[PDB]
Amino acid sequence: MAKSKNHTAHNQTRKAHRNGIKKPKTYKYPSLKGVDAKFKRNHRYALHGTAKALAKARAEKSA
RNA sequence: GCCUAGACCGAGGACUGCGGUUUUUACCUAGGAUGUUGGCAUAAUGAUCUUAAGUCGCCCGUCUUGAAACACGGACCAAGGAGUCUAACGUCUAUGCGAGUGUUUGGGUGUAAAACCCGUACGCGUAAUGAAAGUGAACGAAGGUGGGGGCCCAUUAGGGUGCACCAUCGACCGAUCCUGAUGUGUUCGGAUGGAUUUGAGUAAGAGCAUAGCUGUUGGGACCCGAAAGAUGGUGAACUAUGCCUGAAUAGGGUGAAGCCAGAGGAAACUCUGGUGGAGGCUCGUAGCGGUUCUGACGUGCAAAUCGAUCGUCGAAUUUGGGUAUAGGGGCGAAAGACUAAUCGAACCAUCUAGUAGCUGGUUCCUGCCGAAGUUUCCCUCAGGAUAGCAGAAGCUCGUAUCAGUUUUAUGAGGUAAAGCGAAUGAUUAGAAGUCUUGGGGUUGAAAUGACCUUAACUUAUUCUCAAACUUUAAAUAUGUAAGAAGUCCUUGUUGCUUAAUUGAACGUGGACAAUUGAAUGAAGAGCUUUUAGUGGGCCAUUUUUGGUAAGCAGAACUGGCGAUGCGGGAUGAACCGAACGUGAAGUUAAAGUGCCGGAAUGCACGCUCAUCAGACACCACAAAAGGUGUUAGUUCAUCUAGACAGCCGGACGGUGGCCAUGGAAGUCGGAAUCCGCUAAGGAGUGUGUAACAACUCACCGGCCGAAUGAACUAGCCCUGAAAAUGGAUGGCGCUCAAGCGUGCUACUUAUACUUCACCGUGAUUGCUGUUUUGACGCUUUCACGAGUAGGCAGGCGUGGAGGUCAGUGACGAAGCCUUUGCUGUAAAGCUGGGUCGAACGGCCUCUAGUGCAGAUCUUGGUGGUAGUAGCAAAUAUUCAAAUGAGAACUUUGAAGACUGAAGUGGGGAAAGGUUCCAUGUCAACAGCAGUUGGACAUGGGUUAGUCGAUCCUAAGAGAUGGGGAAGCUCCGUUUCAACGUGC
RNA sequence: UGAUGGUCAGAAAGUGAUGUUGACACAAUGUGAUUUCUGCCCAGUGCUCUGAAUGUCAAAGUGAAGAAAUUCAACCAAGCGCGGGUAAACGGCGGGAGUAACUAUGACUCUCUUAAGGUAGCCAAAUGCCUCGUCAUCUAAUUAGUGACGCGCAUGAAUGGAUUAACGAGAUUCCCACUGUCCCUAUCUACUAUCUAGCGAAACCACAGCCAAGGGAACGGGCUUGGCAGAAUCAGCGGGGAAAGAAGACCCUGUUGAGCUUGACUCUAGUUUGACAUUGUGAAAAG
RNA sequence: CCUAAGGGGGACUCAUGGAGAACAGAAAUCUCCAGUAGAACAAAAGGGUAAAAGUCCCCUUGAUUUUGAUUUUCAGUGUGAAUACAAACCAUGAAAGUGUGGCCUAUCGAUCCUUUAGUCCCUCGGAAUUUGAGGCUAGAGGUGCCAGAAAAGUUACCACAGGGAUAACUGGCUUGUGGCAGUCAAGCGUUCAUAGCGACAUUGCUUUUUGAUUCUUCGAUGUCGGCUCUUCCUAUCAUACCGAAGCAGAAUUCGGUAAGCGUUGGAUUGUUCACCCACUAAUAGGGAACGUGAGCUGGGUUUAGACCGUCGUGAGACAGGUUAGUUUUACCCUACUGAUGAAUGUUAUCGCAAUAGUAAUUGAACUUAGUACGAGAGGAACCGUUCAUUCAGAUAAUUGGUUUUUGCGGCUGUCUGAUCAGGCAACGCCGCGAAGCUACCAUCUGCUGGAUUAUGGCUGAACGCCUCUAAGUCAGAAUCCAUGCUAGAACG
RNA sequence: GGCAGCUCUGCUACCA
Ligand SMILES: [Mg+2]
Ligand SMILES: [Mg+2]
Ligand SMILES: [Mg+2]
Ligand SMILES: [Mg+2]
Ligand SMILES: [Mg+2]
Ligand SMILES: [Mg+2]
Ligand SMILES: [Mg+2]
Ligand SMILES: [Mg+2]
Ligand SMILES: [Mg+2]
Ligand SMILES: [Mg+2]
Ligand SMILES: [Mg+2]
Ligand SMILES: [Mg+2]
Ligand SMILES: [Mg+2]
Ligand SMILES: [Mg+2]
Ligand SMILES: [Mg+2]
Ligand SMILES: [Mg+2]
Ligand SMILES: [Mg+2]
Ligand SMILES: [Mg+2]
Ligand SMILES: [Mg+2]
Ligand SMILES: [Mg+2]
Ligand SMILES: [Mg+2]
Ligand SMILES: [Mg+2]
Ligand SMILES: [Mg+2]
Ligand SMILES: [Mg+2]
Ligand SMILES: [Mg+2]
Ligand SMILES: [Mg+2]
Ligand SMILES: [Mg+2]
Ligand SMILES: [Mg+2]
Ligand SMILES: [Mg+2]
Ligand SMILES: [Mg+2]
Ligand SMILES: [Mg+2]
Ligand SMILES: [Mg+2]
Ligand SMILES: [Mg+2]
Ligand SMILES: [Mg+2]
Ligand SMILES: [Mg+2]
Ligand SMILES: [Mg+2]
Ligand SMILES: [Mg+2]
Ligand SMILES: [Mg+2]
Ligand SMILES: [Mg+2]
Ligand SMILES: [Mg+2]
Ligand SMILES: [Mg+2]
Ligand SMILES: [Mg+2]
Ligand SMILES: [Mg+2]
Ligand SMILES: [Mg+2]
Ligand SMILES: [Mg+2]
Ligand SMILES: [Mg+2]
Ligand SMILES: [Mg+2]
Ligand SMILES: [Mg+2]
Ligand SMILES: [Mg+2]
Ligand SMILES: [Mg+2]
Ligand SMILES: [Mg+2]
Ligand SMILES: [Mg+2]
Ligand SMILES: [Mg+2]
Ligand SMILES: [Mg+2]
Ligand SMILES: [Mg+2]
Ligand SMILES: [Mg+2]
Ligand SMILES: [Mg+2]
Ligand SMILES: [Mg+2]
Ligand SMILES: [Mg+2]
Ligand SMILES: [Mg+2]
Ligand SMILES: [Mg+2]
Ligand SMILES: [Mg+2]
Ligand SMILES: [Mg+2]
Ligand SMILES: [Mg+2]
Ligand SMILES: [Mg+2]
Ligand SMILES: [Mg+2]
Ligand SMILES: [Mg+2]
Ligand SMILES: [Mg+2]
Ligand SMILES: [Mg+2]
Ligand SMILES: [Mg+2]
Ligand SMILES: [Mg+2]
Ligand SMILES: [Mg+2]
Ligand SMILES: [Mg+2]
Ligand SMILES: [Mg+2]
Ligand SMILES: [Mg+2]
Ligand SMILES: [Mg+2]
Ligand SMILES: [Mg+2]
Ligand SMILES: [Mg+2]
Ligand SMILES: [Mg+2]
Ligand SMILES: [Mg+2]
Ligand SMILES: [Mg+2]
Ligand SMILES: [Mg+2]
Ligand SMILES: [Mg+2]
Ligand SMILES: [Mg+2]
Ligand SMILES: [Mg+2]
Ligand SMILES: [Mg+2]
Ligand SMILES: [Mg+2]
Ligand SMILES: [Mg+2]
Ligand SMILES: [Mg+2]
Ligand SMILES: [Mg+2]
Ligand SMILES: [Mg+2]
Ligand SMILES: [Mg+2]
Ligand SMILES: [Mg+2]
Ligand SMILES: [Mg+2]
Ligand SMILES: [Mg+2]
Ligand SMILES: [Mg+2]
Ligand SMILES: [Mg+2]
Ligand SMILES: [Mg+2]
Ligand SMILES: [Mg+2]
Ligand SMILES: [Mg+2]
Ligand SMILES: [Mg+2]
Ligand SMILES: [Mg+2]
Ligand SMILES: [Mg+2]
Ligand SMILES: [Mg+2]
Ligand SMILES: [Mg+2]
Ligand SMILES: [Mg+2]
Ligand SMILES: [Mg+2]
Ligand SMILES: [Mg+2]
Ligand SMILES: [Mg+2]
Ligand SMILES: [Mg+2]
Ligand SMILES: [Mg+2]
Ligand SMILES: [Mg+2]
Ligand SMILES: [Mg+2]
Ligand SMILES: [Mg+2]
Ligand SMILES: [Mg+2]
Ligand SMILES: [Mg+2]
Ligand SMILES: [Mg+2]
Ligand SMILES: [Mg+2]
Ligand SMILES: [Mg+2]
Ligand SMILES: [Mg+2]
Ligand SMILES: [Mg+2]
Ligand SMILES: [Mg+2]
Ligand SMILES: [Mg+2]
Ligand SMILES: [Mg+2]
Ligand SMILES: [Mg+2]
Ligand SMILES: [Mg+2]
Ligand SMILES: [Mg+2]
Ligand SMILES: [Mg+2]
Ligand SMILES: [Mg+2]
Ligand SMILES: [Mg+2]
Ligand SMILES: [Mg+2]
Ligand SMILES: [Mg+2]
Ligand SMILES: [Mg+2]
Ligand SMILES: [Mg+2]
Structure with a gap:
């Protein structure tokens, strides 16, 4: 009744390359x-x- | 180099430039069309409206992956109709003042809600940090290092100074932890020095206030929408049940007790005939009910009726009136039934505009940019938050050093492939050995000491495999590097490190200058804030999982559709081509060129003939297996020492060798098989005789002469090949194609490409002693233009407000109608004519109850349907006269009928209220009509001591004395009462 | 349930119904005339009964410690727990193997086990899945009917069993009579429909209205390709308009309800039990 | 799960095989040799490990303290887990070193509240003391729906918001399954693969089964079956014509062209399906929204009443049985069936025929003939004849039906005083009853040519032969096209 | 988690 898409990386590199990478x-x-x-201490x-x-x-080379 | 045919275009508007010819401070073809002629101006020309023709064009809005959908709303039109206001806020912007800022709680004042003035406090800011007691921000030029615009000195470069800001190392304040000086209410104090700790701090303040857009939260909260929940009231005129008081119920049948008479009997008792008139008895009316036709009707006569049929019909019967019981209550011979057409909790008003993650709607134009269906969390799965994607505002700068790419150098990998006489696991077959730690048999009289065998192992081999095997191991994809923040030389700092003078890190000073250390590109790089929508996806190639598969379900990469038109695939979201401002010319892509259809019945080599041909990717189907159909191949074989086919001779023999016994010279049949002349053939191949026959043979002859046979391969065609309305290479039609394979030439045409015009956007050139009444302007140049959700910008329109035009207007405002037109891309603005009658507009600003096609939107109005459905129960009307404008319907007469005394008669109760009666009267009403009427108008009319009410009490209702209750009021009806308005 | 009561009502009351009542009564239930019968089970859940001794055990009260708040301990009502009764209370009422001078069955025996193990009866029944059970009868033919059978998915005794005359607008089968129910239709009457005069609605309506195939939200009136196609119409008709009527009543979702139930979560009227107060005067005895 | 199975150090080498040793053997213990791990390492699996990470021995508590950084999941949040250091304090070893739990990859938990430890520090705000309480830092008590509400059912009495994001029809994709059809040919069939069959395999078709899916429809496409009616398909049951046989005849079986034409009456069941009885030439299979509910019906299913059985404490459930249960609207468009009709100068008569439709069907008896054939048993057919079935189109002589001929007669009740003659009984009833209509309940009528399919042939090559075929050609089916029959284009 | 009796039955209690 509520079976949908589980996971997809479609369109994810397109979005990553609009302003990135x-x-x-x-x-x-x-x-x-x-x-x-x-x-770091030393x-x-x-x-x-x-x-x-x-x-x-x-300071030597000034006065 | 030269000649030559045609088409489209003419932007710009003194000069300036680059060239050329120079006969020249001149001319030119060289920084964009001129010359000349004719005609026309009552018109050639242009625009719009109507219509025809050609071509294309599905119904909008909506949710959706996908709508023209056989998804939903929408018959039509007008008017109304949906992101508002407020409290508190984030970002940004404008403004005033600025370490401050805010007058408006209030006071003063006033031309009186205005304007003007005043100040104390207070708010925010100027200090943080800690839970708190508390403590509380300069080592230094308010620090060092690397950058850094600008400025200064220069003179490419270079040097100095470097605000903002960036990266980095420090310093200071608070908290936490460690250390713990002089001292002391000896348990306090906390100097000093530290710590991979911590704060929304300091480190020459930046805030406060007003306003605007956008965003946020609470509020009715963009508009409309629940099923419900609560508080307080109103109903028992319907109906359910009880009570009180009335009323109603033909005619028959049956024949209980009791009684009379007779007969029989010893008795106990029995039989017969009458009489009688019982019963929640029975047939059957009125009545009450409501079985069946699952009849009629089913936009009805009727929100439950009509007809027939039926149940019951003297009682648990039917019924009027009075009375009681009231909503988590009543009442129920019980169905969740009934409680006023309302019942698994009535009705009315309010809380209430209840809430809704859900459905629907959400109103002007143009310009620019432009998505997501993904991550993580969530009682999360139709929803949110978060990150991403998008817009806007910009800010710091100006080629600085970046990139969905290559090259070179250098890493990582365990997938494809491969492997299994390599590990692991699976797996086929033999062979050689050992059984001594396998059995059977045979040796053995018994010796476990041999042998034949199978089966085991061992050895060297052999066939085949692996997503969860592997020595090996790609392609594609992927990490890093290719310098100035680099390399080299010398020597400074430290509490780290070294045995150290060693190193580590960071440095001073010096050298290496544009080939500063690969390519290619770079509408520049970097940075920040803020906010929208989205968070259902789907498809194609390739990789890929589950499944027989699926237009199925699930992943990977990319590209698409969604969000997208255009040319092609007839048609189609996604395929091919190509992405889109408004045009002209040229050329193409994909696809095509017989006609539909623009372009060839074009050129060419073949193949195919189907009594289901075939005809173009995605894609809209066909396989195995077959064919002496036809075509082309491959490999064998026979061939002029005459091949295959057909017409014609022979094949004598040894030997009728043998066996089967009817007979074998092959031949019902069988094992077999050697020798003499031929160009030739046997103890024999079929046919043929029971047999000897005889033919053909198996071969060789003659006759024309030249090709032939077999197996196989794959082209087209055919068989295989069966579905339902008639029908689809898109249709016609096409057969040396207009089919199939292949090659070539030309040609056709997309919103694509090229040149040009115009619009807009972005960038860009220049413009002040000529800046010159527009610099928010003018101007040069180049590039670009798709768009749902969404963002932003610039504009159009409406009601009202401040100002202005000393605006329009009764000599006609506003409104309305109209091929009168003009302007603008548009929203729209202006105008001619007609109508009309009192107000209205332009511009600069302010303000909002500001824009409609939809919401089964609201109210009003109007259609098609449509002069349509229909006006058909209750037996039935007709003639004449009168009246009247008019007579199916009025009146009177005559007739014909019906109700048929449980009436269609004559009265009443309830209820109505003048409907009664007379006169007049017909606009509306009487679903035809109307002279008539219960209609309309004007009048008139209801007479009581005896008829009712009035009085009595019934079921019941209800004061008082009292008792409860915060109280509205509840109980109680003579009650725990000093109860007579006594006679 | 004997009235100082049972059942029920009310916010309360010096308040009510039964009740003008009194066990032949009132109140609460179950079954449902008559006939014949109503078997076994008190382990479970209820209901009920005693408490001589008794686990748990509230408030108040008591004792101790503490400077006190407070804490600790003892005591401690009803209830629960413990013990008994009760089925015309709710309800329940078993499996596995062997066995008789053929076979079949199993009178009989063994074995596990319950609170008891379904008794008398009845049955493919309105209760039986398999199932249209098997046999008989009824018919030419019967998933129907009736009579038998019974290891009965899952019959059975006042959650009443088995019968039963009479009665029934109850359900079912057969027979006679009867017939247009049918073979197989025909004819007739009145009222409609029809036509006219008068009168005159409504549903519904995006736009509309001819087909076939294609593709397409996979069943087109519109699109593509074909067939075709000639005004205006009347009576009928029910193929289509996935015709109209109603925001599917089935299904699912919603952090939407409501009616009902119970050992759901959380409460509650009532009732019961204790303490304090109302609450005083004596006597006796145990602490 | 583990005080070691954590930490450090040391020593040793494992699984297994071979050869040997009293009982002793396939397996006890001892010895040697071989032994890349074929062992073991708590627990899944993978990786890792040989003077060890394995086995044994010795010492231990680093499984400790303080608070930061980092990796994974990631929003670069939390939780879990892990990594490298800093500052302590320790363990171990000669030492270098190693050790912040388990060789590595899983083994776990916020706010609020409670409790403990630490600091014995801060606060209880008019000032103190002592109790008590509250703070600060770190653990624990727990949320497994594991980023973490406090939670039982039923609804067949039901409601609302929605959903074609999603089930129960049709349709669409698919075709496992169902159904049907091929190819090969081991066998069957006296012999003999292929007359008729055909295993082991293998290729298909169909959408008349059932699945699979969830694309359309939830502001509704009326969900079983039957009745009625039309049409279509062919995978042909019958009928026409034929080919084949393990075809003598008769019967039957296999196959071709063929859907022209037919395919029934009943018992039981709501049934689809089934199963019998019977007739018949045959009683073939399917589709058309599983055709067909504004066509009907309503037996079934599937609202609300009620009963039973099993289940449930109960309300209630049952895809189990049983009984009772409202079936609405067409007047619109189209389409169908009929009916008019403007204009093609007017009007009238007579015609033609494009196109569309079409029609016949099957049986029996007699004869052939007790013939062919056959040993017999049995037993046909063509020509022909008379009838009949189903259908079609008419018709009304006759016969039957029908009666508002209210035509004639009769009968009851009542009314008109009687009679005569009439009225009424929601046509009063009955008998006859012409006409009209009408019935396989009556009668009549239902044509003959051509072209073909399958198939059988002729001539005849290819391929000197053969061959129905390739060119050409003959006959031939209930087929087709005409003839005939119906309409007549209202734009012939 | 408290009582109490026979490894345990009964009663009572319940903010992470
Ligand atoms: Mg999703
Ligand atoms: Mg010009
Ligand atoms: Mg078109
Ligand atoms: Mg919508
Ligand atoms: Mg959809
Ligand atoms: Mg649309
Ligand atoms: Mg559709
Ligand atoms: Mg719909
Ligand atoms: Mg909708
Ligand atoms: Mg509508
Ligand atoms: Mg308006
Ligand atoms: Mg302040
Ligand atoms: Mg402070
Ligand atoms: Mg500062
Ligand atoms: Mg509302
Ligand atoms: Mg509530
Ligand atoms: Mg009444
Ligand atoms: Mg009736
Ligand atoms: Mg009816
Ligand atoms: Mg009707
Ligand atoms: Mg009656
Ligand atoms: Mg009920
Ligand atoms: Mg009512
Ligand atoms: Mg609202
Ligand atoms: Mg939701
Ligand atoms: Mg764009
Ligand atoms: Mg949660
Ligand atoms: Mg939605
Ligand atoms: Mg591999
Ligand atoms: Mg891998
Ligand atoms: Mg491989
Ligand atoms: Mg290899
Ligand atoms: Mg191997
Ligand atoms: Mg958002
Ligand atoms: Mg979001
Ligand atoms: Mg989805
Ligand atoms: Mg979308
Ligand atoms: Mg596109
Ligand atoms: Mg196109
Ligand atoms: Mg196509
Ligand atoms: Mg055409
Ligand atoms: Mg052309
Ligand atoms: Mg084709
Ligand atoms: Mg084409
Ligand atoms: Mg063509
Ligand atoms: Mg654009
Ligand atoms: Mg206004
Ligand atoms: Mg004026
Ligand atoms: Mg004018
Ligand atoms: Mg005017
Ligand atoms: Mg005026
Ligand atoms: Mg003005
Ligand atoms: Mg408004
Ligand atoms: Mg409007
Ligand atoms: Mg109208
Ligand atoms: Mg009419
Ligand atoms: Mg009527
Ligand atoms: Mg009469
Ligand atoms: Mg009157
Ligand atoms: Mg009238
Ligand atoms: Mg009138
Ligand atoms: Mg009047
Ligand atoms: Mg009187
Ligand atoms: Mg009086
Ligand atoms: Mg009284
Ligand atoms: Mg009083
Ligand atoms: Mg009882
Ligand atoms: Mg019991
Ligand atoms: Mg008991
Ligand atoms: Mg106590
Ligand atoms: Mg007690
Ligand atoms: Mg028994
Ligand atoms: Mg039984
Ligand atoms: Mg039965
Ligand atoms: Mg029968
Ligand atoms: Mg039977
Ligand atoms: Mg039972
Ligand atoms: Mg009993
Ligand atoms: Mg029972
Ligand atoms: Mg009886
Ligand atoms: Mg009866
Ligand atoms: Mg009765
Ligand atoms: Mg009609
Ligand atoms: Mg289709
Ligand atoms: Mg169509
Ligand atoms: Mg339509
Ligand atoms: Mg067309
Ligand atoms: Mg219809
Ligand atoms: Mg009709
Ligand atoms: Mg809905
Ligand atoms: Mg939810
Ligand atoms: Mg509720
Ligand atoms: Mg309810
Ligand atoms: Mg150890
Ligand atoms: Mg270890
Ligand atoms: Mg060691
Ligand atoms: Mg992290
Ligand atoms: Mg974890
Ligand atoms: Mg204080
Ligand atoms: Mg105080
Ligand atoms: Mg914890
Ligand atoms: Mg917890
Ligand atoms: Mg959760
Ligand atoms: Mg979670
Ligand atoms: Mg149910
Ligand atoms: Mg769907
Ligand atoms: Mg199939
Ligand atoms: Mg199949
Ligand atoms: Mg054989
Ligand atoms: Mg479906
Ligand atoms: Mg639906
Ligand atoms: Mg329909
Ligand atoms: Mg409908
Ligand atoms: Mg056929
Ligand atoms: Mg045949
Ligand atoms: Mg036919
Ligand atoms: Mg029947
Ligand atoms: Mg079908
Ligand atoms: Mg159907
Ligand atoms: Mg229909
Ligand atoms: Mg109907
Ligand atoms: Mg029924
Ligand atoms: Mg029912
Ligand atoms: Mg029970
Ligand atoms: Mg009934
Ligand atoms: Mg004869
Ligand atoms: Mg007569
Ligand atoms: Mg009369
Ligand atoms: Mg009468
Ligand atoms: Mg007669
Ligand atoms: Mg011949
Ligand atoms: Mg032939
Ligand atoms: Mg031929
Ligand atoms: Mg004509």
């Missing part, structure tokens, strides 16, 4: 989410020290 954008810096915490200290060294190097 879009590749994700790439960025210079990926997010570090999921990267090892021990590496990587914070390495970047902080790098900024200090560059700041001092420029």
